Short mmCIF file of C-alpha atoms and ligand atoms in Angstrom, two decimals:
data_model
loop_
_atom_site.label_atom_id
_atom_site.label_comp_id
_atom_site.label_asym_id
_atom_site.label_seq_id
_atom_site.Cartn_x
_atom_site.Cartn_y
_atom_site.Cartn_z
CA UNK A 1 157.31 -2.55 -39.70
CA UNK A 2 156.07 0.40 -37.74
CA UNK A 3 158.93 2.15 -36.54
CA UNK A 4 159.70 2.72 -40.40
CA UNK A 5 157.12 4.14 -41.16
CA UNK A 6 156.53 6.08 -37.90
CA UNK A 7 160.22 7.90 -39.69
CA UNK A 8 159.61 7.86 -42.66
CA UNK A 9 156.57 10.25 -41.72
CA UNK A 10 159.02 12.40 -39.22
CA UNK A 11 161.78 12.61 -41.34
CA UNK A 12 158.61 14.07 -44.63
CA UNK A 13 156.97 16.55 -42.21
CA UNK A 14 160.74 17.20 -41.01
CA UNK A 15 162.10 18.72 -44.15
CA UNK A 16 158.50 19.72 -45.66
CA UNK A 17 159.08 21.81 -42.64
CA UNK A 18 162.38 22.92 -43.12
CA UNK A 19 161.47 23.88 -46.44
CA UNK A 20 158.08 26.50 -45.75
CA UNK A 21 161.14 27.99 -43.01
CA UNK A 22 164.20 28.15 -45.27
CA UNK A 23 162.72 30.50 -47.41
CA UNK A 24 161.13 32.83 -45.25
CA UNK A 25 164.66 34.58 -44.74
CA UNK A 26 165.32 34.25 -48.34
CA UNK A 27 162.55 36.02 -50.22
CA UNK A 28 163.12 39.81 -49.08
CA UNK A 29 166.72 38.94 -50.81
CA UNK A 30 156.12 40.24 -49.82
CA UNK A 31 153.08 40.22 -51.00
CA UNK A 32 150.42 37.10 -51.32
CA UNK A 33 153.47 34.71 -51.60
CA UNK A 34 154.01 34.26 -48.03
CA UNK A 35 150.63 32.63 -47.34
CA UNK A 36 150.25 31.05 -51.43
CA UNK A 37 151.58 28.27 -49.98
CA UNK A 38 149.45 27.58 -47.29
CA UNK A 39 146.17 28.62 -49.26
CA UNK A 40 147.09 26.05 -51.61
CA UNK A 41 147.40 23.40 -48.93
CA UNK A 42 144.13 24.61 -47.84
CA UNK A 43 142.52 24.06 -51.22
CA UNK A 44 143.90 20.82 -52.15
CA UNK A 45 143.57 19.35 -48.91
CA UNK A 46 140.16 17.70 -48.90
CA UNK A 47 141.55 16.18 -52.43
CA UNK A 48 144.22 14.08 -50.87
CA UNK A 49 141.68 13.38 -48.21
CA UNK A 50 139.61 11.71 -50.48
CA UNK A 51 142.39 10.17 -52.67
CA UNK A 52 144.01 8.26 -49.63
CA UNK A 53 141.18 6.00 -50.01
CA UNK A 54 140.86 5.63 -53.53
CA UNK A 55 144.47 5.21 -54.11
CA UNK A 56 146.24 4.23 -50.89
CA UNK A 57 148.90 6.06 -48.67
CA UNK A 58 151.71 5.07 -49.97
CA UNK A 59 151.39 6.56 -53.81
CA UNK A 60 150.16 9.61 -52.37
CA UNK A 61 152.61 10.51 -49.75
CA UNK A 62 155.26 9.44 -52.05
CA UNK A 63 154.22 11.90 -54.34
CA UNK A 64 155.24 14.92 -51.50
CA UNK A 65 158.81 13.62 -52.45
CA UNK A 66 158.73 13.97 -56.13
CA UNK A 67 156.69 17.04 -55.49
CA UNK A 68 158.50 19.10 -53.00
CA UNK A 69 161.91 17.86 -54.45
CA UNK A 70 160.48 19.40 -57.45
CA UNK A 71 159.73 22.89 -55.20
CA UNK A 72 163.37 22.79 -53.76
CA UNK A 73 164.92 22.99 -57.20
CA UNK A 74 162.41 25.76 -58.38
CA UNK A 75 163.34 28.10 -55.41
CA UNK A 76 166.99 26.68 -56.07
CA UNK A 77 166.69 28.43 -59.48
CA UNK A 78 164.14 31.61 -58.89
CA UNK A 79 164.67 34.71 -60.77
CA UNK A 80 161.05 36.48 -61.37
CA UNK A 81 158.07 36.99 -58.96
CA UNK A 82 156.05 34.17 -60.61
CA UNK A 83 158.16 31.66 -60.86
CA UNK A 84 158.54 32.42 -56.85
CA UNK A 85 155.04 32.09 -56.86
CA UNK A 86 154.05 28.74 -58.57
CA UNK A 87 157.37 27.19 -56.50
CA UNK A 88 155.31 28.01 -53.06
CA UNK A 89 152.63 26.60 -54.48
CA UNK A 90 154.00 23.78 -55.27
CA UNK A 91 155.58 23.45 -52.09
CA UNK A 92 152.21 24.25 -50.79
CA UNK A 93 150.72 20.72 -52.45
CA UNK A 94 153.46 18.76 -51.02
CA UNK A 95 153.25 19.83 -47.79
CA UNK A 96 149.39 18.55 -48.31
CA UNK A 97 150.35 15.24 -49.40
CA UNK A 98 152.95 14.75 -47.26
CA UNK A 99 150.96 15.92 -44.30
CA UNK A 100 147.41 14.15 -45.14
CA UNK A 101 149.16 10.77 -46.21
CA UNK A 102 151.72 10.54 -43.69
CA UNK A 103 149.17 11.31 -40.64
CA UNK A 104 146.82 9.03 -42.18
CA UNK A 105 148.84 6.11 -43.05
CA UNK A 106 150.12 6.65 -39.23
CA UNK A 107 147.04 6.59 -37.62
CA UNK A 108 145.76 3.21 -39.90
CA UNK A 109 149.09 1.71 -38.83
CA UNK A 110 148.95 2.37 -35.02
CA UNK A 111 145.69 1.13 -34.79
CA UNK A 112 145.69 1.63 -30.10
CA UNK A 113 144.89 4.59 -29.12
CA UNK A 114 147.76 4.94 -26.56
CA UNK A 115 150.07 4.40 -28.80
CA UNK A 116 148.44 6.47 -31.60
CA UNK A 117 149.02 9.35 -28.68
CA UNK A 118 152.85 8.91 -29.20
CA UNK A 119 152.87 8.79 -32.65
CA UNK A 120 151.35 11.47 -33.68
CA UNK A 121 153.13 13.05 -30.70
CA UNK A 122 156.60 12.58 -32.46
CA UNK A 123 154.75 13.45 -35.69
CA UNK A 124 154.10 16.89 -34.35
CA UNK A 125 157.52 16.94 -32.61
CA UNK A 126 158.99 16.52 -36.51
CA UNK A 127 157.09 19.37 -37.20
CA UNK A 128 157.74 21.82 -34.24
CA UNK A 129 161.85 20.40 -34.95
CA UNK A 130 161.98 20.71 -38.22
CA UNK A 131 160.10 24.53 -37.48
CA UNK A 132 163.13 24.91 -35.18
CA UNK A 133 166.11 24.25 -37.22
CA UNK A 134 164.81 25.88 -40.61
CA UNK A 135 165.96 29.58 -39.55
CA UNK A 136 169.30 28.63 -38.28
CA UNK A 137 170.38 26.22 -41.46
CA UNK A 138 168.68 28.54 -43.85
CA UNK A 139 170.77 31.44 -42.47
CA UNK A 140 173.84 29.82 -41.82
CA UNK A 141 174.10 28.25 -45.07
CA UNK A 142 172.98 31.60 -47.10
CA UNK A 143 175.67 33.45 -45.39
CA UNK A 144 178.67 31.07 -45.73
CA UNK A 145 177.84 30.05 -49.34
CA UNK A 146 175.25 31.53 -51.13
CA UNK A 147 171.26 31.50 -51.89
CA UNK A 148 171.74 28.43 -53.76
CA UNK A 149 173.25 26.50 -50.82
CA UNK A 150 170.27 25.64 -48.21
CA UNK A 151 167.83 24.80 -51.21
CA UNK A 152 170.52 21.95 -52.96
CA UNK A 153 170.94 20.64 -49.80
CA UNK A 154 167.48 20.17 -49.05
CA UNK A 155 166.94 19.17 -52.45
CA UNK A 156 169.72 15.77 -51.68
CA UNK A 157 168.03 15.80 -47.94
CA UNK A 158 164.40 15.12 -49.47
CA UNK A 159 165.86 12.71 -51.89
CA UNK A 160 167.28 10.82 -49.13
CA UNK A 161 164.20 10.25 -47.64
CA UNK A 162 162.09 9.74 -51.04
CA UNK A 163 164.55 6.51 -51.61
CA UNK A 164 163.73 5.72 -48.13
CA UNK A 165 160.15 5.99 -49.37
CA UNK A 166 160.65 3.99 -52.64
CA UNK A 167 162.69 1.20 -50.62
CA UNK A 168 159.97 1.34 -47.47
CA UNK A 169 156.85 2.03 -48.71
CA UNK A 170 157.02 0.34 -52.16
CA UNK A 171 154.29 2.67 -54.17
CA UNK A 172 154.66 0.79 -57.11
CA UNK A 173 151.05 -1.06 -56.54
CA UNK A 174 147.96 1.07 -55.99
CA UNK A 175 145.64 -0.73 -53.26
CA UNK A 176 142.52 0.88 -52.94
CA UNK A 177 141.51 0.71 -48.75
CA UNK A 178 139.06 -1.94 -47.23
CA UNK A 179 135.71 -0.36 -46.94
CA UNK A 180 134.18 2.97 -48.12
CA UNK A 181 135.33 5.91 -45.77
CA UNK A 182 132.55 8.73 -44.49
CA UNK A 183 131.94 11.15 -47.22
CA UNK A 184 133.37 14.63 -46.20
CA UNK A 185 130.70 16.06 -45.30
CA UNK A 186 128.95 13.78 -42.52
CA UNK A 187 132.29 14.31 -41.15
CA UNK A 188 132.26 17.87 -41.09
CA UNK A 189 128.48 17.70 -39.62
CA UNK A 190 129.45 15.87 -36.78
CA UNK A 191 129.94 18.39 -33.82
CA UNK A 192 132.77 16.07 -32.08
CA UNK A 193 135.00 16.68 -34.71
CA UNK A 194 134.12 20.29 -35.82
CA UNK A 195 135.04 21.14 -32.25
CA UNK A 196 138.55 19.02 -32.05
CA UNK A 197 139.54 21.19 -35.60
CA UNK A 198 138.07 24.31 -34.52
CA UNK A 199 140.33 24.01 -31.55
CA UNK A 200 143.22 23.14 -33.68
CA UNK A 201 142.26 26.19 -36.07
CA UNK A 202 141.77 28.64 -33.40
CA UNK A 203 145.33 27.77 -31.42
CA UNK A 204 147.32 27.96 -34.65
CA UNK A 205 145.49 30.71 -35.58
CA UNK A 206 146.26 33.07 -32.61
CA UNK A 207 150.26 31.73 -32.84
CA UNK A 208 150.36 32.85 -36.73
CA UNK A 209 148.83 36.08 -36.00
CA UNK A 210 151.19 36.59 -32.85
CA UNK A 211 154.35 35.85 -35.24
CA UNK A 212 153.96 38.22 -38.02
CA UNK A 213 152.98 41.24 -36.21
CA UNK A 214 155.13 40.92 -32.82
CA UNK A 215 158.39 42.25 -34.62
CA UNK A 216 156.45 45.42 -35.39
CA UNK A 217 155.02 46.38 -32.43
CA UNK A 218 158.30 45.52 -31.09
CA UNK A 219 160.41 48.17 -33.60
CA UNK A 220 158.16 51.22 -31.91
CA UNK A 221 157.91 50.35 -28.19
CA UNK A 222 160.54 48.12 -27.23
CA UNK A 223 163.03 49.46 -29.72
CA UNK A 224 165.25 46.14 -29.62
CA UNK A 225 168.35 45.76 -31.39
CA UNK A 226 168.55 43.74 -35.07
CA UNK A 227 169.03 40.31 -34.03
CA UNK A 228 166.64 40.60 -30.90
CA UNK A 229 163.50 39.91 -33.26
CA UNK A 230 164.59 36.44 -33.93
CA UNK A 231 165.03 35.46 -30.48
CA UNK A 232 161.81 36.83 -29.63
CA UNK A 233 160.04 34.00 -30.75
CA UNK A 234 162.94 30.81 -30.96
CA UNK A 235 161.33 30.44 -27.07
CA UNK A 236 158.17 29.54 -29.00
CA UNK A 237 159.55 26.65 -31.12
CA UNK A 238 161.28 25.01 -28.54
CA UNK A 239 158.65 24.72 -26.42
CA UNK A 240 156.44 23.68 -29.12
CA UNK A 241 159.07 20.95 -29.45
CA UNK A 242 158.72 19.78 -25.64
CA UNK A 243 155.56 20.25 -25.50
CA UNK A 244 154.21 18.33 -28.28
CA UNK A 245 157.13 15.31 -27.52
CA UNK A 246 155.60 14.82 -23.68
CA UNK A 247 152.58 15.54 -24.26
CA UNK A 248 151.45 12.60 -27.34
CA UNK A 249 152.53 10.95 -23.80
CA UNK A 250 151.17 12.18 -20.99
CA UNK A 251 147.73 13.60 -22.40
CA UNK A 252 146.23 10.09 -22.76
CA UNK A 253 146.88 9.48 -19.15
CA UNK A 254 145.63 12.78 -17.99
CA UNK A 255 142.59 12.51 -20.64
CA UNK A 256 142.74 14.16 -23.84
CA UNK A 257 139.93 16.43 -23.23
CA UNK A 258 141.32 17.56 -19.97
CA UNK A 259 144.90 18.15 -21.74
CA UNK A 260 142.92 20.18 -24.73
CA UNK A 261 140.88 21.98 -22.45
CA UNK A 262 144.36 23.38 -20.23
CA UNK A 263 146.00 23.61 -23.26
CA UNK A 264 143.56 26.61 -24.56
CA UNK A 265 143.32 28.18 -21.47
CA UNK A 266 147.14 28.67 -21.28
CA UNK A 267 147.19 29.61 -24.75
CA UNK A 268 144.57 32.27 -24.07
CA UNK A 269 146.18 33.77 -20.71
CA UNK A 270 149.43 34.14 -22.54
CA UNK A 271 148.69 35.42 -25.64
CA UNK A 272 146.86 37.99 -23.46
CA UNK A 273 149.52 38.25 -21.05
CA UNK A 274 152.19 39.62 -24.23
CA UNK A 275 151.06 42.79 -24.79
CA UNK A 276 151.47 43.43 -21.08
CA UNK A 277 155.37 43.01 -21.59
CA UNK A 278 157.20 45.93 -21.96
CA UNK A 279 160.66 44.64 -22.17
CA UNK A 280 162.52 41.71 -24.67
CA UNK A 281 163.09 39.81 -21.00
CA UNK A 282 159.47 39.97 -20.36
CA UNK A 283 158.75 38.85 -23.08
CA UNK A 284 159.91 35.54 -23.26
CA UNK A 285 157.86 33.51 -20.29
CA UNK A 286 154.41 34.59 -22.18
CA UNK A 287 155.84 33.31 -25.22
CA UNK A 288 157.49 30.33 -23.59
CA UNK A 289 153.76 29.25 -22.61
CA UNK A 290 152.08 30.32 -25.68
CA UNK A 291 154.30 27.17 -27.37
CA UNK A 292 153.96 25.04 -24.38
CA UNK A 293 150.09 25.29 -24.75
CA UNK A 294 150.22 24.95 -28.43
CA UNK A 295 152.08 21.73 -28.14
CA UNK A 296 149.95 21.03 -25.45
CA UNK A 297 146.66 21.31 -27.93
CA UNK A 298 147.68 19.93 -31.28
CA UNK A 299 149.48 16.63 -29.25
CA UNK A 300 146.02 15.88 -27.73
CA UNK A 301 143.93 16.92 -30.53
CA UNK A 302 145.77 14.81 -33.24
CA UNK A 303 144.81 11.29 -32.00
CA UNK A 304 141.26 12.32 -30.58
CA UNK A 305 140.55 12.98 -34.37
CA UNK A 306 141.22 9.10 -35.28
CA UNK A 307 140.12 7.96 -32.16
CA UNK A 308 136.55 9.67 -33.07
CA UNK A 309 136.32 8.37 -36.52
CA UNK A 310 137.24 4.85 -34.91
CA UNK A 311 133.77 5.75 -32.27
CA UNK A 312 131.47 6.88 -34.36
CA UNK A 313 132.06 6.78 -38.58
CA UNK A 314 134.30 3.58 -40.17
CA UNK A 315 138.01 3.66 -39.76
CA UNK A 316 139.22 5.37 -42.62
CA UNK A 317 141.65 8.24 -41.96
CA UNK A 318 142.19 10.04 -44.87
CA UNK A 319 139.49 12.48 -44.95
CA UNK A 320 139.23 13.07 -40.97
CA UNK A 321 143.15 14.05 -41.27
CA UNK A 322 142.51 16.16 -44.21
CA UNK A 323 139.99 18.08 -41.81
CA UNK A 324 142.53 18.16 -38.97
CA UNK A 325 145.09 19.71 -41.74
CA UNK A 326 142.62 21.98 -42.83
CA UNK A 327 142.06 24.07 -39.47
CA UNK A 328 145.57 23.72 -39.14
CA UNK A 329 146.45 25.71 -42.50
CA UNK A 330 143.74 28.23 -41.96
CA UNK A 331 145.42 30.25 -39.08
CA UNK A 332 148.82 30.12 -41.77
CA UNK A 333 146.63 30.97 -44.78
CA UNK A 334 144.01 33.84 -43.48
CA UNK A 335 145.72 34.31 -39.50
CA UNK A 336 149.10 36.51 -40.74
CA UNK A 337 147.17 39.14 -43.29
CA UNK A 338 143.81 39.52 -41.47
CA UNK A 339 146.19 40.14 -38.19
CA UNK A 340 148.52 43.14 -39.80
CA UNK A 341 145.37 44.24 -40.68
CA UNK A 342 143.13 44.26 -37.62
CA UNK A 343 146.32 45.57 -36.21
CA UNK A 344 146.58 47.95 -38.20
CA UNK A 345 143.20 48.71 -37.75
CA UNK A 346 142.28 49.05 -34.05
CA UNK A 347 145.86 47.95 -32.54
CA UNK A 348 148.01 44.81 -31.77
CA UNK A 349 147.17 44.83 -27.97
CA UNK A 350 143.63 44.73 -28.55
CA UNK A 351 144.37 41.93 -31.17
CA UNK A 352 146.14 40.05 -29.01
CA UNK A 353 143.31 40.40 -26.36
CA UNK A 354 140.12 39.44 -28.89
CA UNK A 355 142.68 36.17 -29.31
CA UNK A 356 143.02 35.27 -25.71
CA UNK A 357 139.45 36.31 -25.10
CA UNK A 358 138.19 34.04 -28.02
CA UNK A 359 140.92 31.19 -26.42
CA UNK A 360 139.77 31.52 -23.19
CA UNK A 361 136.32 31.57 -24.47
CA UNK A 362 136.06 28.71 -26.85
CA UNK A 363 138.42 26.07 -24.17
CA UNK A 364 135.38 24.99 -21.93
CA UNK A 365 133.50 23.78 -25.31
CA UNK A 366 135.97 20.82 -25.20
CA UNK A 367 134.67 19.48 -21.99
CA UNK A 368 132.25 18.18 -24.92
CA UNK A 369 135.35 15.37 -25.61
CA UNK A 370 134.94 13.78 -22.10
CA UNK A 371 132.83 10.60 -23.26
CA UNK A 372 131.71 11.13 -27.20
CA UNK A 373 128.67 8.10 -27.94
CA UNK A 374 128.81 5.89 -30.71
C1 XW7 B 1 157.73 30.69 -44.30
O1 XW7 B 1 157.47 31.52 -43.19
C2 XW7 B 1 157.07 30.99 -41.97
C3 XW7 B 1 157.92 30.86 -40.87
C4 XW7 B 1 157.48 30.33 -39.65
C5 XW7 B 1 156.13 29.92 -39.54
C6 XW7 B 1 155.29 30.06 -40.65
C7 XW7 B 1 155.74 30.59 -41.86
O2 XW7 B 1 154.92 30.74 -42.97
C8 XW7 B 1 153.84 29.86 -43.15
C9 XW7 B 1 155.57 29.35 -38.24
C10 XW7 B 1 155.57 27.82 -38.11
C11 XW7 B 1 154.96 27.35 -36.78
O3 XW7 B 1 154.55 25.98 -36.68
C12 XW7 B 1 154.38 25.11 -37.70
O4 XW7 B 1 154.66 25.35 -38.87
C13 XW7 B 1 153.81 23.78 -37.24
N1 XW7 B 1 153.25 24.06 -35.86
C14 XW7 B 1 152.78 23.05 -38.18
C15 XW7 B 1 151.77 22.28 -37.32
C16 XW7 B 1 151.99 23.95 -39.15
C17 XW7 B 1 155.52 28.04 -35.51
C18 XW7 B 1 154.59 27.69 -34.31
C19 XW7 B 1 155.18 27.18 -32.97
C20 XW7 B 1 156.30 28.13 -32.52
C21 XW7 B 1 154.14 27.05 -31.86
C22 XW7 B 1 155.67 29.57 -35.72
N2 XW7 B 1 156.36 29.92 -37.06
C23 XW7 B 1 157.86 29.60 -37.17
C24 XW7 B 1 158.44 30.20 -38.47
#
C-alpha cells in the first residue's frame, strides 16, 4: 500500500534524524566534522538522484539502512579523530539515500497533488520530530548509561525499520523506472525550480547560521545560565514540527505560492527581529516564528517541486528531489562556518540583518509560482 510506505519513509528520515542530533552533544566528550556530514550529502546527492532511475527506489533507500546502521556502530565504537570523521561521512551518504529515495519514491507513489501536500508534509514533520527528540534521548541516555548507550539503541531502532524495509519494500529485484527522467541539468536551467530550491536553500540557510552562533552572542550580552542555551532554540523545533504538520495541509488550499511567499517574509522579519532581544524571554516569540515560517516554507516547497516536474519535464522524481535536497544541505554544509565567520567578522546583529534583508528580499520572487506554463 501507501500508508506503508508513507512510514516507512517517516520512520528513515526519523532516526536518520535522530542520528545527525545524537551526536552533536557527544563529540566535545570541532573542527570540519560538524558539517563533513552534510558536505558529503551535498556531494553525493545528485548521484542518488540519478541512480533512482537507473536502479529504482527501493534498492537505494534500502541501502540508508545498511548504511547508516553501519554509521551508528562506527560512532558506537569511536576512539581517534578519523575514524569520527569517515563515521559522519558515512552517516552523511545515508542521510542522502535515505532522503533522495524516500522523497522520491513518495512523490511517484502519491501521484495527486493534494495529497502529495500531506505527504511530504508528514515527511518533513519526521524530520522536524525526529530534530526534536535527538537532544533529549541523546542526553538522557549518555547520562544514565554511558556514550555507548544512545548509539546501540539507535543502531536496534534503524534495524527495526530496515526489516520493515526488507519485508515492505522487497529490494531484492532491481526495476529500472518507465521512461527516461530530465537530465540534471535542464532541470537546474529551468527558473521554476531554481527559484522553489533557492527558497529552500536560503530559509535553511539563515536557520543554520542562526543556531550555531546564537549561544555565543548569548554568553556576552545576555549572560544566561548553563542550561538556558538549549532552551533557546527547543521553541524552534517545535514549531518546525507544527508548522510543517498543518501546513503539507493547509498550503494547497491557500496556494502554495502564497504559503511560500508568507513563509519568507516571516522568516525574514524574525530573524531580523532576534538581535533586537535583549533578554532569554524575548527571545523566544522571534524564534517561535523563525520555525513556524520555516515549516511554513519547506511544507509548501516540497510538493511544488514534483508538482513542477509533473508540468513541465516527465515524471521522474529522483533527480528534482536530489535538487530539493541539495539547497537543503547547503545552508547545513557552508551556513554554520561562513556565519561564525561573518560574525566574527563584522558582528552577529548585522548577520542576522543581511539574512532577513536577503529573506525579505528574495520572498516576492515566488509570486513567480502562481501559474508556471507547460
Ligand atoms: C549535529 O548537529 C546539529 C544539530 C541540529 C541541527 C543541525 C546539526 O548539524 C547538521 C539543526 C537541524 C534543523 O533541521 C533539520 O535538520 C531539518 N529541518 C532537515 C530538513 C535538514 C533545525 C531546524 C528547525 C528548528 C527549523 C535546527 N537544528 C537542530 C539541531
Amino acid at each position: 500500500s501507501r500508508k506503508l510506505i508513507l512510514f516507512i519513509v517517516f520512520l528513515a528520515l526519523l532516526l536518520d534524524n535522530m542520528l545527525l542530533t545524537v551526536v552533536v552533544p557527544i563529540i566535545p566528550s570541532v573542527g570540519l566534522l560538524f558539517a563533513s556530514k552534510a558536505t558529503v550529502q551535498l556531494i553525493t546527492n545528485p548521484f542518488i538522484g540519478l541512480l533512482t532511475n537507473r536502479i529504482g527506489y527501493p534498492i537505494p533507500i534500502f541501502a540508508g539502512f545498511c548504511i547508516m546502521f553501519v554509521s551508528t556502530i562506527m560512532f558506537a565504537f569511536s576512539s581517534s579523530y578519523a575514524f569520527l570523521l569517515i563515521a559522519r561521512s558515512l552517516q552523511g551518504i545515508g542521510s542522502s539515500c535515505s532522503s533522495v529515495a524516500g522523497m522520491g519514491m513518495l512523490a511517484s507513489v502519491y501521484t495527486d497533488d493534494e495529497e502529495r501536500g500531506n505527504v511530504m508534509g508528514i515527511a518533513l514533520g519526521g524530520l522536524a520530530m525526529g530534530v526534536l527528540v535527538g537532544p533529549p534521548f541523546g542526553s538522557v541516555l549518555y547520562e544514565f548509561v554511558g556514550k555507548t548507550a544512545p548509539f546501540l539503541v539507535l543502531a536496534a531502532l534503524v534495524l527495526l525499520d530496515g526489516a520493515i524495509q526488507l519485508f515492505v519494500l522487497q529490494p531484492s529485484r532491481v526495476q529500472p523506472e518507465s521512461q527516461k527522467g530530465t537530465p540534471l541539468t535542464t532541470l537546474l536551467k529551468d527558473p521554476y525550480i531554481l527559484i522553489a530550491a533557492g527558497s529552500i536553500c536560503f530559509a535553511n540557510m539563515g536557520i543554520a547560521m542562526l543556531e550555531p552562533a546564537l549561544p555565543i552572542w548569548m554568553m556576552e550580552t545576555m549572560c544566561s545560565r548553563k542550561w538556558q542555551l538549549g532552551v533557546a532554540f527547543l521553541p524552534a523545533s517545535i514549531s518546525y514540527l507544527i508548522g510543517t504538520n498543518i501546513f503539507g495541509i493547509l498550503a494547497h488550499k491557500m496556494g502554495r505560492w502564497l504559503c511560500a511567499l508568507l513563509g519568507m517574509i516571516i522568516v525574514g522579519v524574525s530573524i531580523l527581529c532576534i538581535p533586537f532581544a535583549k533578554n532569554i524571554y524575548g527571545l523566544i516569540a522571534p524564534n517561535f516564528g523563525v520555525g513556524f515560517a520555516i515549516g511554513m516554507v519547506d511544507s509548501s516547497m516540497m510538493p511544488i517541486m514534483g508538482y513542477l516536474v509533473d508540468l513541465r519535464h516527465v515524471s521522474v522524481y529522483g533527480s528534482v528531489y536530489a535538487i530539493a535536497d541539495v539547497a537543503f544541505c547547503m545552508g547545513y554544509a557552508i551556513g554554520p562556518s561562513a556565519g561564525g565567520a561573518i560574525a566574527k567578522a563584522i558582528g552577529f546583529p548585522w548577520l542576522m540583518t543581511i539574512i532577513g534583508i536577503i529573506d525579505i528580499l528574495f520572498a516576492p520572487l515566488c509570486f513567480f509560482l502562481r501559474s508556471p506554463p507547460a
